[PDB]
Design a protein around this ligand. Structure first.
Ligand SMILES: NC(=O)C1=CN([C@@H]2O[C@H](COP(=O)(O)OP(=O)(O)OC[C@H]3O[C@@H](n4cnc5c(N)ncnc54)[C@H](OP(=O)(O)O)[C@@H]3O)[C@@H](O)[C@H]2O)C=CC1
Ligand SMILES: *P(=O)(O)OCC(C)(C)[C@H](O)C(=O)NCCC(=O)NCCSC(=O)CCCCCCCCCCCCC
Ligand code: SF4
Ligand code: SF4
Ligand code: FES
Ligand SMILES: [Zn+2]
Lengths: 122, 88, 118, 51, 711, 154
């Protein structure tokens, strides 16, 4: 954090015990920060919705069994954390991570075959 | 001996020169012409391709279809298996 | 639309389209955007096709004639036109008419001709 | 939601359902559009490709 | 055998008796050429292939120089360099400065090889000027700007040798030598549009594709021709949502750098009478409808009828892909119907050949088998009209070998000599046991081609057992390890695929049942007797033609240019089309229309991604999984049981074999909608050589012009 | 479940009404392949659409073969969203973000390796090659003992 408030020197996981330790510390910081993210970015959602949505973004990469893949996925998180905790991301970038503030909404793929057929592939 | 009424189409899938299909190839070279003489109103399609694990498909009314494999089976064992598919 | 003549006639000189994929001005200038609009202010250039066919023929005694567009280096790439058919030959780049003097008798006998011919 | 709209008079519309550059193919006239409600009806048609 | 030689140092291994330019290609060496074409006879006129050969005082023309056991070739020596600049200076001295107005611009070999082997500037400034020549009227399809002719002779060689149409020539002498018929004539050849692609320059261009596009702006898709049964490989060049032109791509197994005129010009018929929205017939007038309430009125009508077993009938047209056959086959089966008819007459009854052995209905000695054919009997087929590119391959073998052709059927205007044996079945029995039979019996690699036009002949059962019984009597010549002299020739791109998935009527019983409901699946050539008048007609297709005229519902599908359909060609090769554009209007993918009407009739077909529907096709026929290859038939001898055993007692009537193609230009709905084929027919009929026959351009009787194209 | 489209994939910001429904999204667990599509930042739609790996055919219009020498990977056109007509100027509008993007590869296996690394669906088209045949200028003037059946005209 020498050059910037939430800077972390790029580090390469030594092994799976180390790599899982870092993931849990990353998740902990994010869900800790959710009240602070909800006031600054004036997110019109419960802190619970923010936390459950933060969980989904870690739940996507729960089955990665490559150690070189985890470090890039950790660096992406740390950088996202830094630009959100410093007021660098605009409210527009942050509340665009929630995929229900599209005027089409969360429902943007067709539900099944027939409903996407009657609408021309959605 | 014909197939039981209610069978619509037989489909043998096998390989032209694979060893896995020689037993099936032996069966059809001795079975199919008699199988077609008895009941000519049914299609009996022989469709092959390189590396086709031998299979048979029996279709009935309303498009219900059964598949029994043929790998490992000898020339004799096939006849009962198709008979199970075509007798009721 | 419709009421003014400029909104209806494809060019000031010509009333009809001159290619199969040209949109008529009647259909191009229909719709909401052309309401509360001056159609006499709209860009309406004179059609080139009518002007080119008002051009008199260059009579020539030669089989091959050279056309550069008529302005030296201010014309088109210099090309060569063969005038051996009993018709009027036209420059591919500019459209000007050329005709051999041998076909003047035949050309003067036709009822309708693609160029003034005099 | 459908890609085809037969208007009450009978002409058919073949819409492509996307965003700004799309083809909503509905033509609308909103009288009273400069108040507080009209900006919501106008924006909803326009942002989906309608005149 | 193999000679060995060095070209620019590197050893190449080329067969003895081939030309040097062929070994330069094999050695990875680019040699500039204009006159030489791989598929045309050698001509040494251009002089652009002049290379330096050790022990030769002059530069040699590499295209005409046979390879010898020890020669040395320098292709980059200073001899070669000044040779190529000197020729490029001569080829450009009289060339018209017409690159902005030329259609060959951006794809011209004269331009590219001027940039690569010529000088950067020109030294021709004569006050006397350049050569100029008058234009020539050689039919509607080809526009001529002959000033551009570089005298390669590629088109005279193509028209005289491949097309068998010797009307193009070269009259005159010296600089005043000219290409064209001396007396204006309409080039009458269903292959004549190949001259436009062969032209190194734009002196031969296409009147339809007159000035519409530049080559750089075209998206190129490698797809398949479906306008004939041969499955010709093509390139579809499109600018956005409009197909601009269709070109030929190489496939030596099928079409060999050549396409016919129908497959090249019918693409203007893809933007003229398209079905773009669902239609319902209300009070005798077709009203527009949505999909949700056109598929509903399909279901409501079906529930009202409550059809019994086999009362729901399907007729599959001739441009239908295999994916929608398998899908419509399933939905038909879940409705208790095996009534799976085909467009042609006799297609609603079982076929004389079966579909049990693949070899029953295929061109078994593959298209490439003609290259070694020794004797050929054509039965019920005018191959010049039914399979144009195939017809050319027959003539190529005929012109270079002792090939004997005999035909039983209707006499036609042939590009090769052939013996005519008769027109009816007796004239086949009398031939097959007559003088020409011993030609088949004696000549190795014999070939009997049976036209798909006999399948619709009433005597096909007798015709097919007549042929195969001769084949079975004459094996070890007809039925060797790698050869099969039995060949059935499709003319529609859908027939071999339907036969492969078993999309046929199984029994005479299902054939006699009157349907209450007919799904015309792209079917437009159905005989009126095969659709009962009072039935409920659904038409699914892409062009408004006869089928949509009688429909009660019209459902717009996709043309072959905006779907990736599977097609099987007459030889059994399974090829895939690539979509070049998207669907127009509210049209839908054809297999998806079937899958959706499965929800509305309550029997949803399981698959709902096209990947799943290709897994199902694999269960019906695994060859359908193999792409761009023919799968050989193993039990080729089992074919006797359908052809001879189930065809034993045949009620011969003696009616002669009938022509199938009244108009080569008007065969399908895409063709019939095409303005260009309209002009091709009218010019054929009235014998008009004028390029602007029903087209833009000034005439004697049109001083003013005309904007109509096609009328 | 055997080519079943996962209708419940979680969409992202760039998912649209033209995005097809994918069957398989790189979980990050598959053996021997990097899950590059998982860490690329690309949308999910790249994992739904099929790409074609092929060697471009030589133009029929000309004899240069420079463009046939390298394998091209391009995206297949979809039934909707590829091109529509602009109501105002008549221009052609698109929703296909991959329409103008193509990749070049030296070998077929180099393209397959990239496709699997990114999670693309791919169809490989095997090149069509010529059949060699010795061509001889001398044949143009071969002697016919019998009927000519051809009048060669240079
Ligand atoms: N908002 C509410 O609480 C409720 C409103 N409504 C009705 O809903 C409608 C829209 O509501 P809202 O957006 O709040 O209305 P606003 O008062 O905010 O806007 C009304 C619109 O009407 C136009 N307008 C008013 N008088 C005239 C006139 N004489 N000639 C031409 N144009 C005129 C105004 O244009 P300009 O600005 O130039 O005057 C404006 O665009 C109105 O009819 C309103 O009474 C109904 C129930 C409740
Ligand atoms: P438990 O032992 O069951 O699980 C522990 C873990 C998850 C470590 C597994 O055991 C495991 O090994 N899984 C694979 C390793 C792994 O999870 N890799 C990825 C870790 S980094 C990561 O997932 C980053 C996700 C995104 C980070 C940002 C999230 C919030 C962004 C948006 C916030 C709202 C808007 C501002
Ligand atoms: S043929 Fe080629 S070089 Fe000649 S004018 Fe046309 S583009 Fe230019
Ligand atoms: S017209 Fe074209 S193909 Fe024919 S000789 Fe002239 S340049 Fe060659
Ligand atoms: S290429 Fe040999 S002379 Fe033209
Ligand atoms: Zn000029």
């Amino acid at each position: 954090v020498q050059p910037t408030k939430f800077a972390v020197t790029v580090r390469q996981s030594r092994n799976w015990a180390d790599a899982k330790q870092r993931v849990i510390a990353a998740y902990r910081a994010w869900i800790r920060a959710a009240p602070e993210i909800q006031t600054m970015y004036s997110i019109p959602f419960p802190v619970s919705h923010i936390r459950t949505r933060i969980r989904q973004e870690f739940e996507r990469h729960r089955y990665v069994n490559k150690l070189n893949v985890v470090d890039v996925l950790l660096q992406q998180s740390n950088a996202d954390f830094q630009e959100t905790m410093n007021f660098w991301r605009q409210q527009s970038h942050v509340m665009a991570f929630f995929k229900e503030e599209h005027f089409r909404g969360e429902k943007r793929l067709p539900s099944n075959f027939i409903t996407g057929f009657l609408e021309g592939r959605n | 001996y014909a197939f039981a009424k209610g069978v619509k189409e037989l489909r043998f899938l096998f390989c032209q020169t694979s060893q896995h299909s020689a037993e099936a190839r032996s069966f059809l070279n001795r079975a199919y012409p008699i199988m077609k003489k008895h009941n000519p109103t049914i299609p009996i399609l022989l469709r092959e391709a390189q590396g086709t694990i031998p299979r048979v498909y029996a279709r009935y009314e309303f498009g219900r279809e059964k598949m029994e494999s043929l790998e490992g089976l000898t020339d004799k064992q096939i006849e009962e298996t198709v008979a199970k598919l075509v007798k009721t | 639309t419709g009421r003014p003549a400029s909104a209806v006639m494809q060019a000031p000189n010509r009333a009809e389209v001159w290619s199969r994929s040209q949109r008529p001005r009647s259909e191009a200038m229909a719709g909401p955007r052309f309401e509360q609009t001056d159609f006499d202010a709209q860009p309406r250039p004179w059609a080139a096709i009518e002007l080119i066919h008002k051009q008199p023929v260059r009579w020539t005694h030669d089989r091959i004639v050279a056309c550069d567009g008529g302005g030296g280096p201010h014309g088109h790439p210099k090309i060569y036109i063969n005038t051996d058919k009993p018709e009027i030959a036209t420059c591919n780049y500019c459209g000007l008419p050329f005709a051999n003097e041998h076909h003047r008798k035949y050309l003067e006998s036709l009822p309708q001709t693609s160029y003034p011919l005099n | 939601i459908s890609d085809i709209h037969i208007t009450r008079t009978g002409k058919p519309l073949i819409r492509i359902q996307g965003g700004r550059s799309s083809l909503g193919e509905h033509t609308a006239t909103v009288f009273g559009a400069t108040g507080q409600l009209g900006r919501y009806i106008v924006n909803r048609l326009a942002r989906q490709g309608c005149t | 055998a193999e000679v060995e030689l060095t070209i620019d140092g590197k050893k190449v291994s080329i067969e003895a008796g081939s030309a040097l330019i062929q070994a330069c290609e094999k050695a990875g060496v680019v040699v500039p050429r204009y006159c030489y074409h791989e598929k045309l006879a050698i001509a040494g006129n251009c002089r652009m292939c002049l290379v330096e050969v050790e022990r030769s005082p002059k530069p040699v023309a590499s295209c005409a120089w046979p390879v010898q056991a020890g020669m040395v070739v320098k292709t980059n020596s200073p001899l070669t360099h000044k040779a190529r600049e000197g020729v490029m200076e001569f080829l450009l001295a009289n060339h018209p400065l017409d690159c902005p107005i030329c259609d060959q611009g951006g794809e011209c070999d004269l331009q590219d090889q001027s940039m690569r082997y010529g000088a950067d500037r020109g030294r021709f400034h004569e006050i006397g000027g350049k050569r100029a020549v008058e234009d020539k009227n050689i039919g509607p399809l080809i526009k001529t700007s002959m000033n551009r002719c570089i005298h390669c002779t590629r088109c005279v060689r193509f028209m005289n040798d491949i097309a068998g149409a010797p009307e193009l020539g070269s009259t005159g002498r010296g600089n005043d030598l000219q290409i064209g018929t001396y007396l204006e004539k309409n080039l009458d050849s269903e292959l004549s549009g190949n001259v436009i692609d062969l032209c190194p320059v734009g002196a031969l261009t296409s009147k339809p594709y007159a000035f519409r596009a530049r080559p750089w702006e075209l998206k190129r898709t490698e797809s398949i021709d479906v306008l004939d049964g041969l499955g010709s490989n093509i390139r579809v060049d499109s600018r956005g949502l409009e197909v601009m032109r269709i070109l030929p791509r190489l496939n030596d197994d099928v079409n060999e750098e050549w396409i016919n005129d129908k497959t090249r010009f019918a693409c203007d018929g893809l933007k003229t009478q398209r079905l773009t929205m669902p239609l319902v017939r209300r009070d005798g007038k077709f009203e527009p409808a949505t999909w949700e309430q056109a598929l509903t009125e399909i279901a409501h009508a079906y529930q009202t009828l409550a059809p019994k077993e086999n009362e729901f009938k399907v007729i599959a047209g001739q441009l239908v892909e295999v994916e929608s056959l398998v899908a419509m086959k399933d939905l038909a089966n879940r409705l208790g119907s095996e009534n799976l008819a085909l467009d042609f007459p006799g297609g609603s009854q079982p076929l004389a050949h079966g579909v049990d052995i693949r070899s029953n209905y295929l061109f078994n000695s593959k298209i490439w088998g003609i290259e070694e054919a020794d004797a050929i009997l054509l039965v019920g087929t005018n191959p010049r009209h039914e399979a144009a590119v195939l017809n050319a391959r027959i003539r190529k073998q005929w012109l270079r070998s002792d090939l004997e052709i005999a035909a039983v059927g209707q006499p036609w205007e042939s590009t090769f000599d052939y013996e005519h044996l008769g027109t009816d079945l007796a004239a086949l029995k009398n031939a097959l046991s007559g003088p020409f039979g011993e030609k088949l019996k004696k000549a190795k690699r014999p070939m009997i081609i049976v036209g798909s036009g006999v399948t619709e002949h009433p005597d096909a059962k007798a015709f097919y057992e007549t042929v195969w019984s001769f084949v079975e009597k004459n094996a070890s010549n007809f039925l060797t390890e790698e050869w099969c002299g039995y060949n059935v020739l499709q003319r529609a791109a859908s027939r071999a695929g339907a036969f492969e998935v078993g999309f046929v009527v199984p029994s005479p019983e299902v054939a006699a049942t009157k349907p209450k409901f007919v799904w015309l699946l792209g079917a437009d050539e159905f005989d009126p007797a095969d659709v009962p008048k009072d039935a409920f007609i659904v038409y699914q297709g892409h062009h408004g033609d006869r089928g949509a005229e009688i429909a009660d519902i019209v459902l717009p599908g996709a043309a072959y240019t905006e779907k990736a359909g599977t097609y099987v060609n007459t030889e059994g090769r399974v090829q895939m089309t690539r979509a070049a554009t998207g669907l127009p209007g509210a049209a839908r993918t054809d297999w998806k229309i079937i899958r959706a009407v499965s929800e509305f009739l309550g029997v949803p077909l399981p698959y709902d991604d096209v990947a799943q529907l290709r897994d199902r096709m694999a269960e019906i026929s695994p060859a359908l999984a193999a792409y761009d290859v023919v799968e050989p038939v193993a039990l080729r001898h089992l074919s006797k049981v359908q052809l001879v055993d189930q065809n034993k007692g045949a009620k011969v009537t003696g009616e002669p074999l009938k022509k199938v193609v009244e108009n080569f230009y008007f065969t399908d709905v895409i063709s019939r909608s095409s303005p260009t084929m309209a002009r091709c027919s009218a010019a054929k009929e009235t014998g008009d050589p004028r390029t602007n026959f029903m087209a833009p351009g000034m005439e004697e009787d049109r001083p003013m012009g005309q904007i109509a194209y096609g009328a | 479940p055997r080519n079943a489209p996962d209708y419940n994939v979680p969409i992202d910001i760039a998912t649209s009404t033209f995005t097809p429904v994918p069957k398989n999204v790189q979980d990050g667990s598959e053996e021997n392949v990097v899950p590059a599509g998982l860490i690329s930042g690309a949308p999910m739609e790249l994992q739904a659409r099929t790409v074609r790996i092929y060697k471009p055919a030589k133009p029929a219009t000309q004899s240069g073969e420079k463009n046939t020498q390298l394998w091209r990977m391009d995206w297949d056109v979809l039934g909707k969203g590829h091109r529509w007509e602009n109501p105002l100027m008549g221009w052609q509008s698109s929703a296909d973000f991959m329409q103008g993007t193509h990749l070049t590869f030296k070998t077929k296996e180099d393209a397959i390796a990239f496709a699997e690394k990114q999670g693309y669906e791919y169809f490989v088209q095997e090149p069509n090659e010529r059949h060699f045949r010795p061509k001889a200028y001398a044949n143009n003037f071969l002697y016919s003992p019998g009927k000519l059946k051809h009048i060669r005209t240079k």
